[PDB]
Design an enzyme around this catalytic site. Structure first.
Site, mmCIF file in Angstrom:
data_model
loop_
_atom_site.group_PDB
_atom_site.id
_atom_site.type_symbol
_atom_site.label_atom_id
_atom_site.label_comp_id
_atom_site.label_asym_id
_atom_site.label_seq_id
_atom_site.Cartn_x
_atom_site.Cartn_y
_atom_site.Cartn_z
ATOM 1 C CB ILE A 131 -66.575 -11.858 28.042
ATOM 2 C CG1 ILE A 131 -65.405 -11.774 29.051
ATOM 3 C CG2 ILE A 131 -66.101 -12.225 26.611
ATOM 4 C CD1 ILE A 131 -64.601 -13.090 29.224
ATOM 5 N N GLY A 132 -69.244 -11.035 26.532
ATOM 6 C CA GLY A 132 -70.053 -10.927 25.332
ATOM 7 C C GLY A 132 -70.908 -12.143 25.086
ATOM 8 C CD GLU A 133 -74.849 -12.978 24.506
ATOM 9 O OE1 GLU A 133 -75.154 -14.190 24.418
ATOM 10 O OE2 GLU A 133 -75.032 -12.298 25.541
ATOM 11 N N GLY A 134 -71.229 -15.772 22.859
ATOM 12 C CA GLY A 134 -70.502 -16.846 22.196
ATOM 13 C C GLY A 134 -71.298 -17.394 21.030
ATOM 14 C CB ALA A 135 -70.980 -20.609 19.161
ATOM 15 C CE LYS A 169 -70.271 -21.138 23.684
ATOM 16 N NZ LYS A 169 -70.265 -22.404 22.891
ATOM 17 C CG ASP A 224 -66.324 -21.965 11.176
ATOM 18 O OD1 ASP A 224 -67.145 -21.696 12.080
ATOM 19 O OD2 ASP A 224 -66.172 -21.255 10.156
HETATM 20 F F1 LIG Z 1 -65.841 -11.333 21.928
HETATM 21 C C1 LIG Z 1 -65.777 -12.628 22.338
HETATM 22 C C2 LIG Z 1 -66.788 -13.114 23.121
HETATM 23 C C3 LIG Z 1 -66.712 -14.427 23.548
HETATM 24 C C4 LIG Z 1 -65.635 -15.234 23.192
HETATM 25 C C5 LIG Z 1 -65.585 -16.648 23.620
HETATM 26 N N1 LIG Z 1 -66.523 -17.482 23.160
HETATM 27 N N2 LIG Z 1 -66.289 -18.676 23.750
HETATM 28 C C6 LIG Z 1 -65.237 -18.651 24.569
HETATM 29 C C7 LIG Z 1 -64.691 -17.383 24.550
HETATM 30 C C8 LIG Z 1 -63.470 -16.983 25.298
HETATM 31 C C9 LIG Z 1 -62.567 -17.935 25.761
HETATM 32 C C10 LIG Z 1 -61.425 -17.507 26.409
HETATM 33 N N3 LIG Z 1 -61.138 -16.217 26.640
HETATM 34 C C11 LIG Z 1 -62.019 -15.297 26.198
HETATM 35 N N4 LIG Z 1 -61.748 -14.003 26.598
HETATM 36 C C12 LIG Z 1 -61.507 -12.761 25.841
HETATM 37 C C13 LIG Z 1 -61.532 -12.971 24.326
HETATM 38 C C14 LIG Z 1 -62.070 -11.739 23.596
HETATM 39 C C15 LIG Z 1 -61.618 -10.444 24.256
HETATM 40 C C16 LIG Z 1 -62.132 -10.333 25.684
HETATM 41 C C17 LIG Z 1 -62.501 -11.696 26.259
HETATM 42 C C18 LIG Z 1 -63.193 -15.637 25.520
HETATM 43 C C19 LIG Z 1 -64.628 -14.692 22.400
HETATM 44 C C20 LIG Z 1 -64.699 -13.380 21.962
#
Ligand SMILES: Fc1ccc(-c2n[nH]cc2-c2ccnc(NC3CCCCC3)c2)cc1
Length: 344
Positions: free
Chosen positions: A21-25, A44, A139
């Site tokens: 999905i990507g990178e979190g905090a 996460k 925040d």
């Molecule tokens: F671009 C991001 C990357 C990670 C998060 C994230 N960080 N921690 C938890 C999440 C999270 C929680 C629940 N659903 C998501 N999913 C989608 C939210 C962004 C769009 C695609 C993934 C991410 C959010 C946006």
């Protein structure tokens, strides 16, 4: 153990078919298939045990999210970690998979008045619960607001959250802050540590202005540029609002500035609903004592279609909790996440 983008992501056997999905905090986020509930979830990965501040934010967030239970606040479904503190290096937090966040949505989508109104209602409904537990989020910003496919909104990221402390809010001029600059209340740059509920209301007002035009209203580039952005729209604070600022350095800084007149909200947002601008005005009030509170905002005519105090729950009790070593913190993290282990 499954691998994702070169790193270990072992959440099996319950969670399979991982997608980056990507990178979190403070780690990697993947979507996964929950083989028990037969749904895709968000997972996460966090590795905070070598640093005391990462341990503090993790513990803080886990404690808060596990005690909170509200439809507009992200819940923790599950926590994965090793059975012993010696073997525990990583922690996996499982949450409901959301479709997007308000940051991503605002970058590509124009919001209808109905969506702005609904999103604002859900932010304030979630914030009413947080504030009822005597907690400040501190925040709030579009990237901390998650949305599912049906526009259900959930507040996330309690890493900087604190127990409200209005008696100890006062500080000197130019006191360093940690939260995201664009959504910081003007008193943070002047004489506030951000220990009162009014600092969250200011952030929500900033979010509302952003939902109206798809652009941050006060995109300050630094500490005092942020204040110049606020005063260029609200205008110079009144004598009465200045008299509430006792600190000479903060007050004299404001006095040294050339007079600025207010920019009317209907000129910044000509297509906005007039009721939305009236509420915006009350949230983006320079004086934190005069700024609208979460329950008054919910009762505002803009949110009349949704307002229902019997359906806007509060916390069952106030919340109560960094100068603690990372070894004690790892142990506290281990104890907080224990309920999710098989033998419970
Ligand atoms: F671009 C991001 C990357 C990670 C998060 C994230 N960080 N921690 C938890 C999440 C999270 C929680 C629940 N659903 C998501 N999913 C989608 C939210 C962004 C769009 C695609 C993934 C991410 C959010 C946006």
């Amino acid at each position: 153990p499954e691998m994702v983008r070169g790193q270990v992501f072992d959440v099996g056997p319950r969670y399979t078919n991982l997608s980056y999905i990507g990178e979190g905090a403070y780690g990697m986020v993947c979507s996964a298939y929950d083989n028990v509930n037969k749904v895709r979830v968000a997972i996460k990965k966090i590795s905070p045990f070598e640093h005391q501040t990462y341990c503090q934010r993790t513990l803080r967030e886990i404690k808060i999210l596990l005690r909170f239970r509200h439809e507009n606040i992200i819940g923790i479904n599950d926590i994965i970690r090793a059975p012993t503190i010696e073997q525990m290096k990583d922690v996996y937090i499982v949450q409901d998979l959301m479709e997007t966040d308000l940051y991503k949505l605002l970058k590509t989508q124009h919001l209808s008045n109905d969506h702005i109104c609904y999103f604002l209602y859900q932010i304030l409904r979630g914030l009413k619960y947080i504030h009822s537990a005597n907690v400040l989020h501190r925040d709030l910003k579009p990237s901390n607001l998650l949305l599912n496919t049906t526009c259900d909104l959930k507040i996330c990221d309690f890493g900087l959250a604190r127990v409200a402390d209005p008696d100890h809010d006062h500080t000197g001029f130019l006191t360093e802050y940690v939260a995201t600059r664009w959504y910081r209340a003007p008193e943070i740059m002047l004489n506030s540590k951000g220990y009162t509920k009014s600092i969250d209301i200011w952030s929500v007002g900033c979010i509302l202005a952003e939902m109206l035009s798809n652009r941050p209203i006060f995109p300050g580039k630094h500490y005092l540029d942020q204040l110049n952005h606020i005063l260029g729209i609200l205008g110079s604070p009144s004598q009465e609002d200045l008299n509430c600022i006792i600190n000479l350095k903060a007050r004299n800084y404001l006095l040294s500035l050339p007079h600025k007149n207010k920019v009317p909200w209907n000129r910044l947002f000509p297509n906005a609903d007039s009721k939305a601008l009236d509420l915006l005005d009350k949230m983006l009030t320079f004086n934190p004592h005069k700024r609208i509170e979460v329950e008054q905002a919910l009762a505002h005519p803009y949110l009349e279609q949704y307002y229902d105090p019997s359906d806007e729950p509060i916390a069952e009790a106030p919340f109560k909790f960094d100068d603690l070593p990372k070894e004690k913190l790892k142990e506290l993290i281990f104890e907080e996440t224990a309920r999710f282990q098989p033998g419970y």
